[PDB]
Amino acid sequence: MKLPVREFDAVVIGAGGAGMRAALQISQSGQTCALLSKVFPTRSHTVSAQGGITVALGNTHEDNWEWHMYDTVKGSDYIGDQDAIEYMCKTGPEAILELEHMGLPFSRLDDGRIYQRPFGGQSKNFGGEQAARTAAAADRTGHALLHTLYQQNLKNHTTIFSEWYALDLVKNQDGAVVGCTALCIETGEVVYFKARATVLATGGAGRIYQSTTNAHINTGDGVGMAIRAGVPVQDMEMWQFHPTGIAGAGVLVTEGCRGEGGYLLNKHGERFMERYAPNAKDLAGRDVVARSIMIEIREGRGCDGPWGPHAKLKLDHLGKEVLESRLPGILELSRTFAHVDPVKEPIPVIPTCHYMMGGIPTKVTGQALTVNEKGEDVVVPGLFAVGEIACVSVHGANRLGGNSLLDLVVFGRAAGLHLQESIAEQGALRDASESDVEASLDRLNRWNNNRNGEDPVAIRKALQECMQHNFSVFREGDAMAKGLEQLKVIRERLKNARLDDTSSEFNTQRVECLELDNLMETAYATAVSANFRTESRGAHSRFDFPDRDDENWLCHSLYLPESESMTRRSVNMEPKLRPAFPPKIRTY
Amino acid sequence: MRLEFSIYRYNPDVDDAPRMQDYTLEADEGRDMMLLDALIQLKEKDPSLSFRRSCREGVCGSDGLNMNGKNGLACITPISALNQPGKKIVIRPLPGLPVIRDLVVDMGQFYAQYEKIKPYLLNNGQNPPAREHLQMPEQREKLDGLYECILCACCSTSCPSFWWNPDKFIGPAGLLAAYRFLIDSRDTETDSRLDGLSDAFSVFRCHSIMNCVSVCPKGLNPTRAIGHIKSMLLQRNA
């Protein structure tokens, strides 16, 4: 060891919503835990979250966790593991009420209970009338949640390593993950964080696209790290394009706009969603509302303007009093980035890259999975994953609005509750040798030595453009095969890319370079995946295979990093407390 | 059209002291961009320029800067609001904090005052609720204008009293947070809290200078918050 070694029982890489619930939970179970974050914990993408948390509290109306389980399984287009969705939807209410006790400042009903708003794909009585179960704090719910969890980690004296960039996972000689090497952004020091549990909580990867609702920091870091360690990723082709991103900006306006009574109009003033989804209307599934807006533009019925092609989101009818109280956050977002006042005039909106449904395959415990040579699941000892970087999978092919925040809290907490059994189950793990650690540093050393290679700026711009064009809302086998060819080219260019700033005192260039590597593996894993799946399920929409193929593709897709091929994994359809929901034709 | 910037630079491994460097950027005439767009592009030209940013939508609080003399967030300040005829756009770190590198400041002391006011719900556990704590929309209203704070530091690093005693005076940001728990109807520790703000510096170094209010990217008002804190302190200790 010629590196400093910092030992903990658990290292949580990422201080977003899910990292911080996990860290807080591991910590209260009397285990030492290091919380890393490449930004200050409250700058994590979770802060930008708006709509709220979907959960059968049953405050606005009588509700039932099974109805929410139904909504989700259907929402997922029948490839969400149902044992997991059952766990989530059922645990939900207590797990969220816990946050309200932590001081989270939820909005209120007149009687004093947590406010719940209507949201996309929510129904009473298993596919019946429109429900309202998205608990919220105005439209700043993610902010409210993150800041509360930070405060809770402050109260509980969690060891937080703010502004450290995790480089890569360290594997011992048994193929077990025993921590990770990380770079301290402030000072440039590189250290080995040794652990018996390494928990990846590194959020999403919107920045593989040209236009995304995601923060600049969403660079699929966990996907890269996991792929390079030979850990498979799953369902990488499932990319949620949020219906209402602001046209020409990418900054999200919430689904809570439609949930509060707002609706989508085309150039002729037709509420086109009544045609596309006659029951649920504008509160249909996101992949459906997404495609609906695109079909509208793609046939000349979209509007233009300084914003580019878009549909309109009409809100003005809800009144000043309700907009400034329930949705004041999008009011500022619209005025700033669209120069449009939603109290007077509709917001310009186009489907934008939003949420990564895929990620590292996990058990409910948060334990990370791989497959053996026979295709069976085996646990990756010492590796765990929670949050957006996880593919549990509770979202399958399309995530419901307000279900990601639930995901974070429920599985973050679960990973902590279950960490002691998980360490005991995997047994003691052998020490990493000095070469094992050195291997984690190989990636970083390459950039620190490459002075004359390619400008990474152009490599990035190439990458994002390629994804935008070839792997968007609609896809065809032709464009996808060519898109993959260019990615093999761009990935070559990156192996010879130059780091232009050589300094150590807070060198943001080095970070953004290391991020690019992660953008690459994430774009690649998505591209190889979307090619493999020859059907149309949820967000994944092929012209050349427009039918949902329940006979061949009622499964998860799995990218195998070592041989760079694909394979499938079972969807789980055995809930413990009720019978499964069978696959049927899904229309809104 | 051409834009000129005078931007604060400093590297302790290179620079003896800090210096202003000049920058030009060719921008699209008919498009208006944000300062952060300009900074991002300047790093394509000069990779050594270091600065914080994330959400790029004025929610996360990462990119607080002193722009043409006044604090704000780069991500939400338009080029047009800064650009003047024949004058450079002058970008400098937040005032009063240790510069780590270029436009990055050590926020240490800003966080440390935040930690000092115990910014977490403190409920004694007596008469616990069946489910959630019950809060009437009336009482929840009192948290509006307080919980939205993004810890961007703009207000505190524009307060003289904070400059002079950054480790003894809580500062606008801190005091805003303090009041956020002082009037939360779910927090039972109000007296205990007030007793920890009764000294000469914690609260009473605020003199209503009102730099705090003018700069807040989220248009909150620390002055009015501190007013209510003082009120409560007189109510209790006078």
Place this chain on the structure above:
Amino acid sequence: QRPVNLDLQTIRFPITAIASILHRVSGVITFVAVGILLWLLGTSLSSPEGFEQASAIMGSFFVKFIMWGILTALAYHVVVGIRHMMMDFGYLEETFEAGKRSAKISFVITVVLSLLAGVLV
């Protein structure tokens, strides 16, 4: 040891910030002023001759100036101190807009008193 950005020339200051820094200075001046004013009062009362000597001092143009300054600073400290106190008792709002407004009205009320102090001298 690290550097900090505290160059006061590189920083915009709104009118309420100016109003405040002048209140601080005006206070420090008024402190020294009391000693000067007491010393002058002492003289002007000790004997009929002392008073004539004090009128003679007050006759000097240079004194008339310092005296007008002294009384201007005091007049300021009082008007801008009353603004402050009104805010503290809720008679003025604590919004940024109500701040700018009262600051200006404080400068106007001060100039008026500063002239009347010139008249008295």
Place this chain on the structure above:
Amino acid sequence: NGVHDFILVRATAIVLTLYIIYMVGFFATSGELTYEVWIGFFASAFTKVFTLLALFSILIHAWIGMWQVLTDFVKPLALRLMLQLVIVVALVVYVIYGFVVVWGV
């Protein structure tokens, strides 16, 4: 403590404001300032009391004010306590010198 300092300043400010009203009042309504009407105003019990009362008020008000100012700027301890010594002594002198002037009139 802090709350005490806050009330004392504002209280003395009120007393001092009432005193200034009283001084400017006389000054703006007397015309010719002859030695005799000047000494007549300052030999009056009302004036003597209000003046010393005001002098005590300046002792307390200015001392707090000066302290606040010094603990913002004069950082090194030695030098700060020296300046406070001078400043207090001065203010104490002001009240005592005040007692001498008006007792002798």
